[PDB]
Design an enzyme around this catalytic site. Sequence first.
Site, PDB file in Angstrom:
ATOM      1  N   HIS A  17      -7.061  -0.405  11.247  1.00  0.00           N
ATOM      2  CA  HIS A  17      -6.328  -0.917  10.176  1.00  0.00           C
ATOM      3  C   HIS A  17      -7.479  -2.186   9.583  1.00  0.00           C
ATOM      4  O   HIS A  17      -8.046  -2.775  10.322  1.00  0.00           O
ATOM      5  CB  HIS A  17      -4.775  -1.697  10.803  1.00  0.00           C
ATOM      6  CG  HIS A  17      -4.112  -2.287   9.566  1.00  0.00           C
ATOM      7  ND1 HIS A  17      -4.020  -1.736   8.324  1.00  0.00           N
ATOM      8  CD2 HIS A  17      -3.171  -3.461   9.619  1.00  0.00           C
ATOM      9  CE1 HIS A  17      -3.310  -2.422   7.633  1.00  0.00           C
ATOM     10  NE2 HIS A  17      -2.796  -3.308   8.382  1.00  0.00           N
ATOM     11  N   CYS A  39      -5.367   1.014   3.288  1.00  0.00           N
ATOM     12  CA  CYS A  39      -5.433  -0.395   4.260  1.00  0.00           C
ATOM     13  C   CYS A  39      -6.734  -1.038   3.959  1.00  0.00           C
ATOM     14  O   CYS A  39      -6.987  -2.146   3.556  1.00  0.00           O
ATOM     15  CB  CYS A  39      -5.162  -0.232   5.603  1.00  0.00           C
ATOM     16  SG  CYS A  39      -6.222   0.661   6.501  1.00  0.00           S
ATOM     17  N   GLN A  51       0.861  -1.380   0.078  1.00  0.00           N
ATOM     18  CA  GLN A  51       0.160  -0.166   0.189  1.00  0.00           C
ATOM     19  C   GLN A  51       0.930   1.323   0.101  1.00  0.00           C
ATOM     20  O   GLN A  51       0.352   2.439  -0.047  1.00  0.00           O
ATOM     21  CB  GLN A  51      -1.025   0.106   1.116  1.00  0.00           C
ATOM     22  CG  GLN A  51      -0.294  -0.160   2.628  1.00  0.00           C
ATOM     23  CD  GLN A  51      -1.532   0.127   3.708  1.00  0.00           C
ATOM     24  OE1 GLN A  51      -2.061  -0.668   4.063  1.00  0.00           O
ATOM     25  NE2 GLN A  51      -1.737   1.355   4.163  1.00  0.00           N
ATOM     26  N   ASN A  84      -1.338  -9.161   5.358  1.00  0.00           N
ATOM     27  CA  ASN A  84      -1.232  -7.803   5.342  1.00  0.00           C
ATOM     28  C   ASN A  84      -0.682  -6.940   4.207  1.00  0.00           C
ATOM     29  O   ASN A  84      -0.612  -7.709   3.126  1.00  0.00           O
ATOM     30  CB  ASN A  84      -0.333  -7.248   6.515  1.00  0.00           C
ATOM     31  CG  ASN A  84      -0.505  -6.025   7.229  1.00  0.00           C
ATOM     32  OD1 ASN A  84      -1.195  -5.154   7.031  1.00  0.00           O
ATOM     33  ND2 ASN A  84       0.435  -5.829   8.234  1.00  0.00           N
TER      34      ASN A  84
HETATM   35  C1  LIG Z   1      -5.123   1.975   7.494  1.00  0.00           C
HETATM   36  C2  LIG Z   1      -3.882   2.324   7.749  1.00  0.00           C
HETATM   37  S1  LIG Z   1      -2.254   1.673   8.141  1.00  0.00           S
HETATM   38  O1  LIG Z   1      -1.604   2.977   8.169  1.00  0.00           O
HETATM   39  O2  LIG Z   1      -1.885   1.058   6.929  1.00  0.00           O
HETATM   40  O3  LIG Z   1      -2.264   0.944   9.379  1.00  0.00           O
HETATM   41  C3  LIG Z   1      -1.343   1.191  10.316  1.00  0.00           C
HETATM   42  C4  LIG Z   1      -1.995   0.885  11.442  1.00  0.00           C
HETATM   43  C5  LIG Z   1      -1.415   1.108  12.770  1.00  0.00           C
HETATM   44  C6  LIG Z   1      -0.542   2.123  12.716  1.00  0.00           C
HETATM   45  N1  LIG Z   1       0.231   2.745  14.009  1.00  0.00           N
HETATM   46  O4  LIG Z   1      -0.350   2.179  14.859  1.00  0.00           O
HETATM   47  O5  LIG Z   1       1.090   3.170  14.182  1.00  0.00           O
HETATM   48  C7  LIG Z   1       0.244   2.409  11.713  1.00  0.00           C
HETATM   49  C8  LIG Z   1      -0.167   1.916  10.358  1.00  0.00           C
HETATM   50  C9  LIG Z   1      -5.921   2.798   7.357  1.00  0.00           C
HETATM   51  C10 LIG Z   1      -5.175   4.280   7.835  1.00  0.00           C
HETATM   52  C11 LIG Z   1      -5.930   5.580   7.362  1.00  0.00           C
HETATM   53  C12 LIG Z   1      -5.125   6.701   8.012  1.00  0.00           C
HETATM   54  C13 LIG Z   1      -4.477   7.592   7.162  1.00  0.00           C
HETATM   55  C14 LIG Z   1      -3.716   8.699   7.548  1.00  0.00           C
HETATM   56  C15 LIG Z   1      -3.747   8.990   9.034  1.00  0.00           C
HETATM   57  C16 LIG Z   1      -4.944   8.249   9.833  1.00  0.00           C
HETATM   58  C17 LIG Z   1      -5.698   7.067   9.144  1.00  0.00           C
HETATM   59  N2  LIG Z   1      -7.104   2.913   8.245  1.00  0.00           N
HETATM   60  C18 LIG Z   1      -8.177   2.912   7.768  1.00  0.00           C
HETATM   61  O6  LIG Z   1      -8.422   3.439   6.907  1.00  0.00           O
HETATM   62  C19 LIG Z   1      -9.452   2.643   8.967  1.00  0.00           C
HETATM   63  C20 LIG Z   1      -9.605   1.185   8.706  1.00  0.00           C
HETATM   64  C21 LIG Z   1     -10.758   0.445   9.760  1.00  0.00           C
HETATM   65  C22 LIG Z   1     -10.961   0.870  10.973  1.00  0.00           C
HETATM   66  C23 LIG Z   1     -11.952   0.656  11.729  1.00  0.00           C
HETATM   67  C24 LIG Z   1     -13.021  -0.206  11.028  1.00  0.00           C
HETATM   68  C25 LIG Z   1     -13.024  -0.456   9.568  1.00  0.00           C
HETATM   69  C26 LIG Z   1     -11.849  -0.059   8.939  1.00  0.00           C
HETATM   70  N3  LIG Z   1     -10.487   3.487   8.479  1.00  0.00           N
HETATM   71  C27 LIG Z   1     -10.622   4.553   8.984  1.00  0.00           C
HETATM   72  O7  LIG Z   1      -9.815   5.474   9.381  1.00  0.00           O
HETATM   73  O8  LIG Z   1     -11.731   5.175   8.321  1.00  0.00           O
HETATM   74  C28 LIG Z   1     -12.399   6.590   8.626  1.00  0.00           C
HETATM   75  C29 LIG Z   1     -13.420   7.042   7.733  1.00  0.00           C
HETATM   76  C30 LIG Z   1     -14.585   6.484   8.147  1.00  0.00           C
HETATM   77  C31 LIG Z   1     -15.726   6.851   7.224  1.00  0.00           C
HETATM   78  C32 LIG Z   1     -15.667   7.292   5.774  1.00  0.00           C
HETATM   79  C33 LIG Z   1     -14.180   7.471   5.521  1.00  0.00           C
HETATM   80  C34 LIG Z   1     -13.292   7.388   6.465  1.00  0.00           C
END
Ligand SMILES: *[C@@H](CS(=O)(=O)Oc1ccc([N+](=O)[O-])cc1)[C@H](CCc1ccccc1)NC(=O)[C@H](Cc1ccccc1)NC(=O)OCc1ccccc1
Length: 215
Positions: free
Chosen positions: A162, A25, A19, A182
């Site tokens: 995530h 993610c 990614q 992942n």
């Molecule tokens: C996935 C992110 S990741 O960065 O690849 O994962 C990762 C996890 C944890 C860490 N850490 O603890 O250090 C580091 C890397 C993705 C990140 C999005 C993001 C980008 C920039 C800044 C903050 C966040 N996470 C998501 O997309 C989540 C996934 C999820 C969570 C709960 C339930 C289902 C899926 N989703 C999210 O943030 O959604 C918000 C949203 C809601 C509705 C509509 C649009 C967005």
Amino acid sequence: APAAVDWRARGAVTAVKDQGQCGSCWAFSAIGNVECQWFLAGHPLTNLSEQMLVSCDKTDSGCSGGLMNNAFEWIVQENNGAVYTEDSYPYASGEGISPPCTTSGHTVGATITGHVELPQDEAQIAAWLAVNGPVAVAVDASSWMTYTGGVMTSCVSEQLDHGVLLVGYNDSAAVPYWIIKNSWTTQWGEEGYIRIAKGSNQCLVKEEASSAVVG
Ligand SMILES: *[C@@H](CS(=O)(=O)Oc1ccc([N+](=O)[O-])cc1)[C@H](CCc1ccccc1)NC(=O)[C@H](Cc1ccccc1)NC(=O)OCc1ccccc1
């Protein structure tokens, strides 16, 4: 349910992807699930496009985040159930910026008719996975940056942040575990995978499980 199941053994899982610097993610989780379900429906294993979702799924937020359930619905309600092949719509968001959505020049690699949201129970999720295939799940990936291998018996479980893919489990091992795919390349973890203990809701794995349904 069976003592152990690993969908990679049945040739139902595609190679680990990357990614990059994009917080996409959710797209890898949703597409990984569709790829597996498509194969299980009697079609050849095909790599599908995460870029399609990052760029075109307007109900989600591209590199800023999204929900697998929103993605599944967007495909059905807004894209006529179509999911393009990765070859026709390559990933180009690794730098952290998603290019605009293009509505042509792509080939449909798969189609879905809807999605189901699974019970918040690991035994129940395992039962569904054993028969129906890989499930998209949300987890708390806070303690995942330091993961190098082995079964994680202790995982920080506070906040879902995530989206990943459950490809199997093993209840016959010393410490039963889940096998998770992942999207941080094959350099991370066990060739791109991670094994976490099963049965104690490690990393909040049972909280948001779902899967696409290909009629
Ligand atoms: C996935 C992110 S990741 O960065 O690849 O994962 C990762 C996890 C944890 C860490 N850490 O603890 O250090 C580091 C890397 C993705 C990140 C999005 C993001 C980008 C920039 C800044 C903050 C966040 N996470 C998501 O997309 C989540 C996934 C999820 C969570 C709960 C339930 C289902 C899926 N989703 C999210 O943030 O959604 C918000 C949203 C809601 C509705 C509509 C649009 C967005």
